[PDB]
Subunit: 251 residues, 4 copies
């Protein structure tokens, strides 16, 4: 039987590339999404057309709330209902926008940014672990290579990403006796935000030592694939920067 | 005119030691507390006896919720109401208990552990900045062992990691306002009251420098430094005060 | 044409496992060694039996000295002499022994521990770049450099310096398309001299399986970093430590 | 009796400000220097005028060589000769220049950059510990807040500074049982090279979040004074950045 993976926020961009690569590798996939229902369904169609009964969708808001634990449980459940197992969890979904220290209420900003980047990852990890040889079980968290040199006015985003480093390490330690590995992949600049003008995008590309360009989504997915694979069986609690040297560049 | 500081969770232990040291240095202090009302008022009385009208208490739950931003704004407002200014914020209040991955609902655990250790510090920092040779700074009580965490303390460690990111992000953002943001990271200092002496000694014996925990005063000493004029170019730094504990491998 | 790799300290243990996987992957290999001449030749013989004219040995002391730059130049030169190209450098050779602060002179300890773990990697990196596909360097680092073994200050200093080199060289060589990365074991193959009770003490501390990494598990990470699946990765150090570095005292 | 400190590279700039502040705090000082004999002798004269026979000079090249251990031992010996004790060691002396990967020979560049920034600190640390409740013994290493975002083409310098972090941590662990604390101070940009034009100085100044200015030498010395003080007696293995936030600033 083919192993199964949950990928959060998998309808577009890097999450989509991760789902596709895992599927190409032989995984059945749960495509979690929030608002991008058309893209999610279209991706499930494409993957199932390649191999029948290998992709489903699951919608959920991952904003922090009283009902988030239930939603996270239901996401993991959807993998078991469809495929009978859940071998890999990829925590990719993420809110990302500025939250100046000096639009939404601040409590909503907290809920969205800390929920998606940290609390949902923790609750999903709990549900994954509770629900569990030649098993190769693991979790991959999408972190941020620049968390120690953060973007101006993104404090809640950076707090969420830092908490996700903490979860990666804490869960690596705690889940190791069950054979569940927990690792991260830290992009620098990859797919720039769609809102961004090609001029502003070019300002970022020029800062990258390796090629003066952003990472493709596929290059990010390559690191996830490595971490879930049998070639990474002794690796837990590690975060692999995939940043073309960007984090090494001083101001 | 004496400057003024808010210390969160200041009724006892490390927060009291910080409040006391700041008061001894010349500061007027807001002693914030949650449940420890008797201890808070008792400390405030001791301090006012030493110097009249230099200490007030301020009660608030710092659990995460939709009114937490209001509560934090009110804590800052309380400093201005009592003292007409707010020079220093010390983010010390913290919930600390295990949350195993495999009593309280997980919703509550998230709200308390992430609220006290990260979200309240963030909201307090916002309110502090919004209300502003001054020497304005914020000091966050971090944790020296965040990269070598206690087993089954995921949410607490997430909250402390978030606090490091706040320290950094806020140091970057508030520098143009003259507001320095730094941290102090104990390893083992005052052990939990619920801990047995045998288990306390097991932790003590792990510390290279003296085989003992830091006194609360030792932690406060590092806070005093960071708020002082001796630290005027220091921002975004977290000073471990851990007697070498974090350097010791398994 | 097959690409070519230099692996330092490749006669035995982890460096051997790295040479072997690189060769299995398609590389021609320079098996650098210092004292383990028969092991080096035996490995070359095995690899050439598999594919003729694809392995050579190269002898060099990597202790710091005024001739170290010439020796490191000669190692890289030996790869071009055998294979006409040098695509991958793996800085694996390492001295490892205590140097307490309170047989060998301290001058010698410094030369050996800092030469092998830091200065030789620097000079090999210089010569690698000067002599220039998917070009990259991998440095064997140490997952425990922030929680070091007692009385191992010079070894730890060298391993810290090697993190600095990994970072500085990734930055400086990126415009040449040369990626520079690290792999950081926690406990992998335990020292030959170490007694079994002391080995078991270390094994019990590893969260993931309560065992040391095989040399092959360390090599797997090296293979990933030199591969086309790591083309945007530079300046990264991948811990391969079973969670050991996360364990508090 | 007053305590005594050795400060390496103390004739000018940051080392000088550190020596002066220690002396002001009540310490007797060994002013180590290499080439700056006029400056070192003048400083000791100024300090001795303030309090008799409270300063001595000691010249040594801290380049790595066969004689470096003896030299470092003699620096420490000079403090015991002068003052009968040695309570504080400040490893401040440092060579700093580019060594591009692609005219001093490279072996000389190694010897100077690695010798001054790491090997000499290690040998001084050995000699200091070998010579050793009322006592307050400590070492402070001058590190670099930018070691993870290094200057282009400064690999050997950056290697030396990283090795110094390693030493700081290793020596902290190992010397803790003797009551010797080992810490660092990590400037970002402080006194800029003396030749540097103001317009280049301004390029770095404009990057510093806290006041768009470099640190004074005195601001650096303030962190050293804290670390050797009785207010830091539980602090060991810590490196305090004194950088105005510069290291937090992305490319
Ligand atoms: N792109 C980069 O350069 C970069 C850099 C550093 C780190 N990273 C990290 O890498 C990962 C992928 O980045 P990316 O640019 O592909 O991400 P992204 O497009 O910004 O967001 C990925 C998905 O997150 C989901 N999402 C957002 N808010 C949500 C909520 N409240 N509930 C549930 N899902 C929500 C969205 O789903 P729907 O579209 O279905 O609504 C969105 O498609 C992220 O974790 C990110 O932080 C990316
Ligand atoms: N002790 C250590 O060894 C150690 C080690 C590492 C880090 N630290 C850090 O240093 C700081 C001080 O440590 P400590 O041991 O003195 O702390 P503590 O006694 O565990 O907590 C201090 C105060 O936090 C307040 N608090 C807890 N939950 C709260 C809530 N929901 N709302 C508002 N306030 C709440 C409590 O106030 P009331 O009593 O008034 O309810 C409590 O007195 C903490 O940030 C801690 O994480 C300590
Ligand atoms: N094993 C572990 O648990 C572990 C843990 C952390 C990091 N690492 C790192 O991983 C790498 C491989 O580890 P390992 O245990 O396989 O290494 P090792 O067996 O201790 O050393 C590998 C080789 O280094 C060479 N070497 C030593 N001194 C030399 C000198 N002066 N000049 C030239 N070559 C010299 C030796 O070659 P000859 O035999 O030919 O003389 C030796 O076979 C090392 O960089 C090590 O620091 C290993
Ligand atoms: N300035 C900054 O912004 C900055 C930034 C990051 C870190 N730091 C660190 O802070 C410390 C002080 O910086 P600084 O700018 O004041 O340093 P500096 O002026 O560049 O150098 C300090 C002294 O080092 C001594 N020195 C140089 N080469 C030597 C050798 N071969 N042997 C013995 N002594 C030697 C020199 O002594 P003589 O003059 O007597 O020859 C020099 O005066 C250094 O460790 C530095 O790396 C400084
Ligand atoms: N660009 C970019 C993003 C980044 C980049 C982070 C960064 C932080 C500091 C400096 C440079 C880049 N993080 C993202 N997260 C989500 N969910 N979506 C995104 O588009 C990005
Ligand atoms: N002991 C202890 C504490 C710690 C210790 C953290 C630790 C983590 C890993 C290894 C050792 C100590 N953090 C605390 N936070 C609060 N609010 N109160 C506490 O009593 C502690
Ligand atoms: N075990 C082990 C080794 C280690 C392990 C380092 C370590 C440091 C701190 C805590 C645990 C392991 N490094 C080695 N380097 C070389 N060249 N050879 C070795 O055998 C080892
Ligand atoms: N400026 C500067 C210096 C620096 C600055 C290092 C740096 C590295 C990366 C980014 C910014 C500054 N280090 C120095 N060391 C010595 N001995 N002397 C110096 O003048 C400096």
């Amino acid at each position: 039987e083919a192993p199964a993976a949950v990928v959060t926020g998998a309808a577009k961009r890097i999450g989509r590339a991760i789902a596709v690569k895992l599927h190409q590798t032989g995984y059945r996939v749960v495509i979690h999404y929030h608002n991008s229902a058309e893209a999610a369904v279209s991706l499930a169609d494409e993957l199932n057309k390649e191999r029948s009964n290998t992709a489903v969708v699951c919608q959920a808001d991952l904003t922090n709330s009283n009902v988030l634990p239930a939603s996270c449980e239901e996401i993991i459940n959807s993998c078991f209902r469809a495929f009978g197992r859940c071998d890999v969890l990829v925590n990719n979904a993420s809110a990302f926008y500025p939250t100046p220290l000096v639009g939404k209420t601040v409590e909503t900003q907290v809920a969205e940014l800390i929920g998606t980047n940290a609390i949902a990852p923790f609750l999903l990890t709990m549900s994954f672990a509770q629900r569990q040889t030649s098993s190769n079980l693991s979790i991959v968290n999408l972190c941020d290579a620049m968390v120690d040199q953060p973007c101006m006015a993104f404090s809640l985003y950076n707090m969420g990403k830092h908490a996700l480093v903490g979860l990666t390490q804490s869960a690596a330690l705690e889940l190791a006796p069950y054979g569940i590995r927990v690792n991260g992949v830290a992009p620098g600049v990859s797919l720039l935000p769609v809102a961004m003008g090609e001029e502003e995008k070019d300002k970022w590309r020029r800062k990258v030592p390796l090629g003066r360009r952003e990472a493709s989504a596929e290059q990010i997915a390559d690191a996830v694939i490595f971490l879930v694979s049998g070639s990474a069986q002794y690796i837990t609690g590690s975060i692999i920067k995939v940043d073309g040297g960007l984090s090494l560049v001083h101001a």
